[PDB]
Amino acid sequence: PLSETKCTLKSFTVEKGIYQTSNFRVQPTESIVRFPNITNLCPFGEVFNA
């Protein structure tokens, strides 16, 4: 991180204190998709198993 502070201040010496470097975000790992129960499916065997 010291190199990051040196970048942000644009100097090769940094005085005593607290500095802000950047921000981070937690990256999502998984994708979840949900849909209701599969019911009343289209009749297909009534024109085949007739």
Partner 1 sequence: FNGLTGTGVLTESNKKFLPFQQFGRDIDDTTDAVRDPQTLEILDITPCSFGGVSVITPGTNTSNQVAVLYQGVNCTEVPGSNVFQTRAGCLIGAEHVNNSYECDIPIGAGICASYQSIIAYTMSLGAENSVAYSNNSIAIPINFTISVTTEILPVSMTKTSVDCT
Ligand X SMILES: *[C@@H]1O[C@H](CO)[C@@H](O)[C@H](O)[C@H]1NC(C)=O
Chain residues binding ligand X by CB under 6 A are 44-45, 48-49
d(CA 37, CA 26): 32
Residues touching partner 1, count (CB under 8 A): 25
Site membership for partner 1, residue 20 (CB under 8 A): yes
Site membership for partner 1, residue 35 (CB under 8 A): yes
d(CA 39, CA 22): 50
d(CA 17, CA 11): 15
Summarize as ranges the residues that interact with partner 1 (CB under 8 A): 1-2, 4-5, 12-26, 28, 33-37
